[PDB]
């Protein structure tokens, strides 16, 4: 039997400019955190994107970074995760858990306007989908890794009628991993066996 222990951090957050990772991964321990465009390196409840360096950064990214401002508040309460847009510019969220909840296309990007908030994750709904996916086989459970990640772009939308069609075309975006759900997935995926067709060592 494998040992499991409670995650010390409920999520990790990685920042990107276009297709490039920028800065170290942030790990959140307390229930609420803010990701903002300012510069404190030393607050465990603030992931401050304004201090992160990118010697390669272009003018659009610089301009967009000045608008992040107060950014997004992310908080985990009672098995649910919320995102509140504190920035004067909207944020754009691709949450596969929301998309499943509301019957939207899996790649749907939902705007959170300034001052608004969205429930970006519900643990019970994830656990229900995880149980249903077991009956559909290895690949259906393996694909649930994507449900444990949420991507958010500051200022700029992507998808549908926006000019940018992929998150890596947005100037400033974050990728959140939800550790609780990842550990639940591990408990099930480790019991699902292997893919049906084997993988050659040479192809």
């Amino acid at each position: 039997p494998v040992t499991y222990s409670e995650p010390a951090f409920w999520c990790s957050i990685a920042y990107y400019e276009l297709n490039q990772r920028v800065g170290e991964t942030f790990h959140a321990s307390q229930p609420s955190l803010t990701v903002d465009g300012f510069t404190d390196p030393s607050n465990s409840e603030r992931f401050c994107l304004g201090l992160l360096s990118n010697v390669n950064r272009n003018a659009t990214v610089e301009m967009t970074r000045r608008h992040i401002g107060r950014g997004v508040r992310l908080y985990y309460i009672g098995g649910e995760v919320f995102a509140e847009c504190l920035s004067d510019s909207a944020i754009f969220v691709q949450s596969p858990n929301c998309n499943q909840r509301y019957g939207w296309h899996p790649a749907t990007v939902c705007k959170i306007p300034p001052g608004c908030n969205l429930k970006i994750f519900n643990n019970q709904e994830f656990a229900a989908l995880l149980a249903q996916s077991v009956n559909q086989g290895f690949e259906a459970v393996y694909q649930l890794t994507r449900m444990c990640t949420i991507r958010m772009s500051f200022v700029k939308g992507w998808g549908a009628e926006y000019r940018r069609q992929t998150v890596t075309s947005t100037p400033c975006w974050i990728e959140l991993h939800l550790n609780g759900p990842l550990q639940w997935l591990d408990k099930v995926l480790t019991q699902m066996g292997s893919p049906s067709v084997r993988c050659s060592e040479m192809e």
Binding site: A127, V134, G137, V188, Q191, M192
Partner: peptide, 19 residues
Amino acid sequence: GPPPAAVEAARQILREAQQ
């Protein structure tokens, strides 16, 4: 059919998420 151990693991998680 599905692997019963995976069904049971998922069942315990659904219970935990309810609690």
